């Protein structure tokens, strides 16, 4: 079967991270939408204009709003993208056939929205040469960050080709986890986010979202299905593009 | 020998077009700077804020200004990038060891700055699905454009892989040729732009900058050296990356 996949990049990234997977999925006959979230990729806004992970998710929410009644999509979020999925699911759960997590954070409904992010920072506290800054938006101090080139090379694009790593150095922009904002955000709901089918995809060779973290997430909030990809790195859509496409095809044939 | 190469993308593009060539040149021991011109790539400005090809060239001029006395670079401009080279050469000719034109427009000093652009539009008048718009800046009506996806696929990235073409669809932004502005701009000077060494690189398989146009340019303003790359397409830095690196190495060993 064919599905309409909506690819969601992580913070400091953009639609460009999906430049290898998008055409491959289309070669299988699928419809693919790869969005640039707020202040990401070639979006015109700067991060200082964004005050929360919800505002950051605007392009995704706006896209879902534009879907005609009856049309459902399969969301695919990488790394921090799982948070955008949860936010979108609490507004448009009826338009989501399923959500696929790609070496992604997996929010739950029993703890605060920052729960898995707080855990991530415990497991991976040293972001190496990554730099930080602060800005104020809507009366709140937000911590922004710019991914360090060494962190990118060693922990995120560990086994990616030099031409892919180059794109990361050229295109990654300043962003934010909005951690303190997430901590005070209302909990994700059981009726919305909690109701959607969730497929968790990961590799134990991820050098930032370490096994301890990902296995912890799986036990914390049981996914409907788990796929473990052998080898690769954090950016499986680059190092294991084919394997990811095969998995997404199976998801398309399973949930509609 | 090693050189410091400054790669200059064309309109509607950004530093990202050089994502394959930059690491290859560095693998040869060179220093490489790939800039995002105004309102290009991840630059924060929008095209409506830019009123001329000179303003558009700001990042390049600012970069050259930052070079300490005695430091020279080799400029490499693709497609419309030759115009940024001419503009920069009339301000910092002493900092330019040489300029390499990559399937690029080659301005001269005997005719108005729009001369080769006017000729290009004669040779290639149909930009297919490319869309146009107008905006006003500093009392002048500027014609902006957004490269059509079919034009990108068939004439610019003709033989590029699907993953490279995907990047183009995801990252190309609205831009402008500032043709009418160039037409009224003071002529490029013989003392500045005219004094620098110029190396012209091209392929007769270019599907937009057709042989008639490129051979016309070579006869109009004789380059110091001409390199003809066999095969490939308009984006030689993607389809013939290795060949381009080899040529640039020879240039580095010839001009300093």
Curated annotation (Swiss-Prot), chains A, B:
Cysteines engaged in disulfide bonds, as pairs: none
Phenotype upon changing residue 10 to A: Loss of catalytic activity
One example of a Gene Ontology biological process annotation: jasmonic acid metabolic process
Biotechnology: This enzyme can be used as a biocatalyst for stereoselective synthesis of a wide array of (S)-cyanohydrins by addition of HCN to aldehydes or ketones. Optically active cyanohydrins are interesting intermediates for the synthesis of alpha-hydroxy acids, alpha-hydroxy ketones, or beta-ethanolamines, all of which are important building blocks in organic synthesis.
Post-translational modification comment from the UniProt entry: The N-terminus is blocked.
Activity vs pH: Optimum pH is between 5.3 and 5.7.
Tree of life domain: Eukaryota
Residue positions of the active site: 79 (proton donor/acceptor), 234 (proton donor/acceptor)
Annotated TM spans: none
SUPFAM superfamilies linked to this entry: alpha/beta-Hydrolases (SSF53474)
InterPro entries: AB_hydrolase_1 (IPR000073), AB_hydrolase_fold (IPR029058), MES/HNL (IPR045889)
Keywords tagged on the record: Lyase
Entry binding sites for (S)-mandelonitrile: 10, 79
Catalysed reaction, written as an equation: a monosubstituted aliphatic (S)-hydroxynitrile = an aldehyde + hydrogen cyanide; a disubstituted aliphatic (S)-hydroxynitrile = a ketone + hydrogen cyanide; an aromatic (S)-hydroxynitrile = an aromatic aldehyde + hydrogen cyanide; 2-hydroxy-2-methylpropanenitrile = acetone + hydrogen cyanide
Activity regulation, short description: Inhibited by hexafluoracetone and rhodanide (thiocyanate). Also inhibited by trichloroacetaldehyde via a covalent link on Ser-79. Susceptible to several serine, histidine and cysteine inhibitors: is strongly inhibited by diisopropyl fluorophosphate, diethyl pyrocarbonate, HgCl(2) and parachloromercuribenzoate (PCMB), to a lesser extent by iodoacetamide (IAAM) and iodoacetic acid (IAA), but barely by AgNO(3) and PbNO(3).
Record-annotated site: Increases basicity of active site His: 206
Binding site for 2-hydroxy-2-methylpropanenitrile: 10, 79, 235
Residues engaged in binding acetone: 10, 79
Domain AB hydrolase-1: 4-240
Key word Lyase present: yes
Similarity comment text for this entry: Belongs to the AB hydrolase superfamily. Hydroxynitrile lyase family.
Function per UniProt: Involved in cyanogenesis, the release of HCN from cyanogenic glycosides in injured tissues; the release of toxic HCN is believed to play a central role in the defense mechanism of plants against herbivores and microbial attack. Decomposes a variety of cyanohydrins (alpha-hydroxynitriles) into HCN and the corresponding aldehydes or ketones; two natural substrates are 2-hydroxy-2-methylpropanenitrile (acetone cyanohydrin) and 2-hydroxy-2-methylbutanenitrile (2-butanone cyanohydrin), but in vitro can also act on mandelonitrile.
Assembly mode: Homodimer or homotetramer.
Protein name: (S)-hydroxynitrile lyase
Organism: Hevea brasiliensis
